[PDB]
Amino acid sequence: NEVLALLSRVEAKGKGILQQNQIIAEFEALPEQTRKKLEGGPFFDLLKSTQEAIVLPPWVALAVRPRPGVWEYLRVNLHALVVEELQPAEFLHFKEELVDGVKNGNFTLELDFEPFNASIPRPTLHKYIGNGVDFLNRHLSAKLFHDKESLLPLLKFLRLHSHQGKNLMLSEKIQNLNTLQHTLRKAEEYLAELKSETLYEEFEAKFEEIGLERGWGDNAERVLDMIRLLLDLLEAPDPCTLETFLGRVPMVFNVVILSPHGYFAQDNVLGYPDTGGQVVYILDQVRALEIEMLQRIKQQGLNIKPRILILTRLLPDAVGTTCGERLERVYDSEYCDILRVPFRTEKGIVRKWISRFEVWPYLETYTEDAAVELSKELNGKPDLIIGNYSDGNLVASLLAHKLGVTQCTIAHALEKTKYPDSDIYWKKLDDKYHFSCQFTADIFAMNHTDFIITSTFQEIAGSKETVGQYESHTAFTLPGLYRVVHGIDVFDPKFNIVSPGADMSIYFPYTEEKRRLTKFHSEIEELLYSDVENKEHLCVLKDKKKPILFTMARLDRVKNLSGLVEWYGKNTRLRELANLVVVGGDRRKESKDNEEKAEMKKMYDLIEEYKLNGQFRWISSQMDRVRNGELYRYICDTKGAFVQPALYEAFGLTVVEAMTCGLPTFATCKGGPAEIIVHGKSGFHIDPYHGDQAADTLADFFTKCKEDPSHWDEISKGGLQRIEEKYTWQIYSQRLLTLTGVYGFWKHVSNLDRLEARRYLEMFYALKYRPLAQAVPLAQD
């Protein structure tokens, strides 16, 4: 039935040479098409699952995505019956012709990691995506099972393992699997007799004689389980045993965390350009980590003092902050300090703030300087290094290589998905965003790291219909620069989902009166309802009694708050029902950020266009997380709602924050919030691409709530539960330390294979990143 397909195919051409997302790809052609559809059936499934379609004059190329992480590419003749299967490289040719007019010159670069990763087989099952350690535990457990040469790495590992000159686990006396096998048995025999609560100090003398150093446990009971797990691993390995053992071995003492860009600090920062959830995440992370690290250290019978350092930039000139000081104790922790190192060039240190899109030329020297400073601060080298975002992941990768430390990376966001078609359109965007530097770093850190943590499944593989954040890096091209044929694989065993949370001392249900912070109510009321218009707040709320539609975020284009303002301004029904309150941007000072400055001008116009005075309150950056918690709960009092209208949102901590306070939430369906919220149950999804619908959806909510105030309560509970089940810090740390254990061991078992990748990556950094990063215009004081 070709008379039909050609209908759709001639639909596509009318659009002309260009990119088409499934948004349009199906939208225009299938539904906006005449009843000639009469389709269902085959080719509807195919078209529906098509992720994007590249239209050039004679042909349309289709990237088809049947299942998450499964792709096939196709060229079809616009007017013709012909359909040919494209290879990934071939499809990317198309994209390139669309822009340069020409596919990349024959000997232009193809990045291919596929042949490197081939060391260990790939899972094909949806169930292991974001579960990679489970896959690895099972593969190690098999490789280890009765293989002499296979067990040795474990022995050597334990035998060399030490911290600060104090030997741990096994001593130099155990040279082979028999001696070890023997000692473990003698030790189990001895220990099996003594009382459960017997301290390690009692039998310590005996152990040292037979070659057993500290770290097996604090008391006899614990030590015995350890030694049994090990006998079991030498004997009949199984995944749970392997994981349990490797996780329990004391390893992580000194931790190094990289977060160079933005103003990273504990006060007077959140809401400035580049300063946001990542900062909030890390501060919550180390506190939890330190608590867990102490616990384990003790349980294993050790007195070691842990140290966690957060490496960021020293910013001499940002007044009102502590960003100027080299060392800062993290609030509410004993062992976590922030360690600030300055950017510099031959001419000396660079004072001024620099956008995260511009920091590339400063990162290498930063790595050098950082290694020195943490060397001054740490006693013994780092046992774990975690990279954060692009710059951090970059720096974290260089250090991990330099010092030989187990590496983890966390994206926190991936710009290629926040800025659609920014890969194929990279060149027109470069003077401004330098995405050629950043995509390079991303691709680099991504394959350079030992493991990767994501906050959600969708961050890796997306959903059934839409592609993941990482998955979108599998095949792309930057025409004129290079072409990534396989840059990452959603099925990679290194991906682990470990979900964060909000700090339950700061954020809790609005309904616990005892804990409500009333001392903030005077300020909050002035902040919302006052009649004064100034750099802190603009316009004025006429009716103090309505529900409040609330939002808070950095002000940049993707966050798309100006968009919400418009949706709101246009909808008379929604303006009638509720007041709009938007926290974003800091109007106290001159904005040095491109998008934010731009975004502020829109905001000012929108205020005039829709005559927003009386329904709208535009608040500047709210920098105190403690008062912020109260603010949310106050929105709760008005029986209002939180809305997150981002064009794309990588994770969305504020979504978690509101749900946690019991504030019903409407979040963008693009990115992480799609996973966080179960629509109808834990809150509602809205599409930033249809805003008027978004507004009407909200109007519907406030109307239902008016007629039935219990509707409100339903979602508030739905949300609260979702958070209890899904996003909380208690479990996070333990997961992290265990991951660190397993991948740490895997690192040695698999070292021989990863040398080819080691050197490929080295060359990529040296001959691609460095040149690009050096071409970036330097900040001038």
Ligand X SMILES: O=c1ccn([C@@H]2O[C@H](COP(=O)(O)OP(=O)(O)O)[C@@H](O)[C@H]2O)c(=O)[nH]1
Residues that bind ligand X (CB under 6 A): 270-271, 276-278, 280, 552-554, 583, 621-622, 625, 628, 651-654, 657
| Contacts (CB under 6 A) with ligand FRU, residues 7-66 | none
Which one of K ion, ligand X, a copy of itself, none interacts with residue 161, CB within 5 to 8 A by kind?
K ion
Cα dist from 10 to 37, 75, 326, whole Å: 14, 15, 63
Which one of ligand FRU, a copy of itself, ligand X, none interacts with residue 274, CB within 5 to 8 A by kind?
ligand FRU
Closer residue to ligand X in complex, CB, 612/646: 646
Which one of K ion, ligand FRU, a copy of itself, none interacts with residue 768, CB within 5 to 8 A by kind?
a copy of itself
Closer residue to ligand X in complex, CB, 378/655: 655
Q: How many binding residues for ligand FRU (CB under 6 A)?
A: 12
User: x/- string (CB under 6 A) for ligand FRU, residues 475-494?
Assistant: --------------------
> Cβ-count burial of 465 within 10 angstroms (0-12 exposed, 13-18 middle, 19+ buried)?
exposed
Question: Which of 368, 377, 421, 700 touches a copy of itself (CB under 8 A)?
Answer: 368
CB of residue 356 vs ligand FRU: minimum separation in angstroms? 5
The one segment of 93-101, 108-116, 185-193, 564-572 that binds a copy of itself by CB under 8 A? 108-116
Name 469's Cβ contacts closer than 8 Å, sequence gap at least 6. Answer: 411, 414, 417, 458, 459, 460, 462, 650, 671
Beta-carbon count within 10 A of 328 CB: 18
Q: What residue type is assigned to position 65 of the chain?
A: R
Specify whether the backbone of 146 is left (phi greater than 0), alpha (psi in -120 to 50) or beta. left
Q: How many binding residues for a copy of itself (CB under 8 A)?
A: 33
Per the structure block, which two tokens stand in for 252?
């992580």
| Contacts (CB under 8 A) with a copy of itself, residues 390-409 | 398, 402
Q: What residue type is assigned to position 713 of the chain?
A: D
CB of residue 744 vs ligand X: minimum separation in angstroms? 29
Q: Helix, strand, or coil here: 701?
A: helix
Name 378's Cβ contacts closer than 8 Å, sequence gap at least 6. Answer: 254, 256, 307, 309
Closer residue to ligand FRU in complex, CB, 274/489: 274
Query: Can residue 109 be called a binding residue for a copy of itself (CB under 8 A)?
Result: yes
Angle at 233 between CA 232 and CA 237, to 5 degrees: 95
Residue with token string 């990162």: 363
Rg value, the chain, Cα: 28
CB of residue 169 vs K ion: minimum separation in angstroms? 5
Closer residue to a copy of itself in complex, CB, 18/766: 766
Question: Which of 428, 535, 589, 759 touches a copy of itself (CB under 8 A)?
Answer: 759
| Contacts (CB under 8 A) with a copy of itself, residues 457-486 | 482
CB of residue 584 vs a copy of itself: minimum separation in angstroms? 38
Query: Can residue 389 be called a binding residue for ligand FRU (CB under 6 A)?
Result: yes
Name 42's Cβ contacts closer than 8 Å, sequence gap at least 6. Answer: none
Which one of a copy of itself, K ion, ligand FRU, none interacts with residue 169, CB within 5 to 8 A by kind?
K ion
Closer residue to ligand X in complex, CB, 508/745: 508
For helices 389-403 and 363-377, what crossing angle results, to 10°? 60
Which one of ligand X, ligand FRU, K ion, none interacts with residue 262, CB within 5 to 8 A by kind?
ligand FRU
CB of residue 651 vs ligand X: minimum separation in angstroms? 5
User: In terms of C-beta distances under 8 Å and separation of at least 24 residues, what long-range contacts does 459-462 make, across chains too?
Assistant: 459/411, 459/497, 459/650, 459/651, 459/672, 460/129, 460/130, 460/490, 460/495, 460/497, 461/68, 461/69, 461/126, 461/129, 461/130, 461/490, 462/68
Which residue, 543, 535, 503, 539, is CA-closest to 660?
503
Q: How many Å apart are CA 456 and CA 473, to the nearest integer?
A: 17
Residue with token string 């539609």: 549
Query: Can residue 277 be called a binding residue for ligand FRU (CB under 6 A)?
Result: yes
3-state helix, strand, coil in the chain (%, to 5): 45, 15, 35
Instruction: Answer for the pair 516, 630: CB distance below 8 angstroms, yes or no.
Output: yes
The one segment of 110-118, 634-642, 648-656, 690-698 that binds a copy of itself by CB under 8 A? 110-118
Beta-carbon count within 10 A of 623 CB: 19
CB of residue 610 vs ligand FRU: minimum separation in angstroms? 28
| Contacts (CB under 6 A) with ligand FRU, residues 401-430 | 412-413
Which residue, 268, 358, 363, is CA-closest to 313?
363
Which residue, 444, 490, 442, is CA-closest to 468?
490
The one segment of 158-166, 471-479, 670-678, 736-744 that binds K ion by CB under 5 A? 158-166
CB of residue 138 vs ligand FRU: minimum separation in angstroms? 33
Query: Can residue 683 be called a binding residue for ligand FRU (CB under 6 A)?
Result: no
Q: How many Å apart are CA 206 and CA 208, to the nearest integer?
A: 6
Instruction: Answer for the pair 268, 321: CB distance below 8 angstroms, yes or no.
Output: yes
Which one of ligand X, ligand FRU, K ion, none interacts with residue 653, CB within 5 to 8 A by kind?
ligand X
Residue nearest ligand X, CB atom distance = 277
Which one of a copy of itself, ligand X, K ion, none interacts with residue 651, CB within 5 to 8 A by kind?
ligand X
Question: Which of 13, 122, 126, 161 touches K ion (CB under 5 A)?
Answer: 161
Instruction: Answer for the pair 55, 94: CB distance below 8 angstroms, yes or no.
Output: no
Secondary structure letter of residue 592 according to DSSP: -
CB of residue 364 vs a copy of itself: minimum separation in angstroms? 6
Name 752's Cβ contacts closer than 8 Å, sequence gap at least 6. Answer: none
Instruction: Answer for the pair 708, 580: CB distance below 8 angstroms, yes or no.
Output: no
Closer residue to ligand X in complex, CB, 640/652: 652
Query: Can residue 767 be called a binding residue for a copy of itself (CB under 8 A)?
Result: yes
Closer residue to K ion in complex, CB, 29/174: 174
Per the structure block, which two tokens stand in for 708?
């039935």
The one segment of 32-40, 103-111, 326-334, 495-503 that binds a copy of itself by CB under 8 A? 103-111
Closer residue to ligand FRU in complex, CB, 8/390: 390
Dihedrals phi, psi of 443, to nearest 5 degrees: -55, -40
Which one of a copy of itself, ligand FRU, ligand X, none interacts with residue 628, CB within 5 to 8 A by kind?
ligand X
Question: Which of 8, 275, 285, 628 touches ligand FRU (CB under 6 A)?
Answer: 275
Instruction: Give exposure, 534-557, as e/b (b: 16+ Cβ within 10 Å).
Output: eebbbeebeeeebbbbbbbbbbbb
Q: How many Å apart are CA 276 and CA 104, to the nearest integer?
A: 38
Query: Can residue 108 be called a binding residue for a copy of itself (CB under 8 A)?
Result: yes
Q: How many Å apart are CA 721 and CA 215, to the nearest integer?
A: 39
Query: Can residue 169 be called a binding residue for K ion (CB under 5 A)?
Result: yes
Q: How many Å apart are CA 263 and CA 279, to the nearest integer?
A: 9
Which one of a copy of itself, ligand FRU, K ion, none interacts with residue 760, CB within 5 to 8 A by kind?
a copy of itself
> Cβ-count burial of 759 within 10 angstroms (0-12 exposed, 13-18 middle, 19+ buried)?
exposed
Q: What residue type is assigned to position 54 of the chain?
A: I
User: x/- string (CB under 8 A) for a copy of itself, residues 739-758?
Assistant: -------------x--xxxx
Quote the distance between the C-alpha of residue 346 and its chain's center.
Answer: 34
Question: Which of 22, 49, 278, 456 touches ligand FRU (CB under 6 A)?
Answer: 278
CB of residue 547 vs a copy of itself: minimum separation in angstroms? 55
Query: Can residue 356 be called a binding residue for ligand FRU (CB under 6 A)?
Result: yes
Closer residue to ligand FRU in complex, CB, 435/745: 435
Beta bridge partners of 111: 484
Question: Which of 106, 303, 522, 710 touches a copy of itself (CB under 8 A)?
Answer: 106
| Contacts (CB under 6 A) with ligand FRU, residues 153-182 | none
Question: Which of 99, 475, 650, 737 touches ligand FRU (CB under 6 A)?
Answer: 650
Where along the sequence are the contacts to a copy of itself (CB under 8 A)? 105-112, 115-116, 118, 364, 367-368, 398, 402, 482, 752, 755-760, 762-768, 770-771
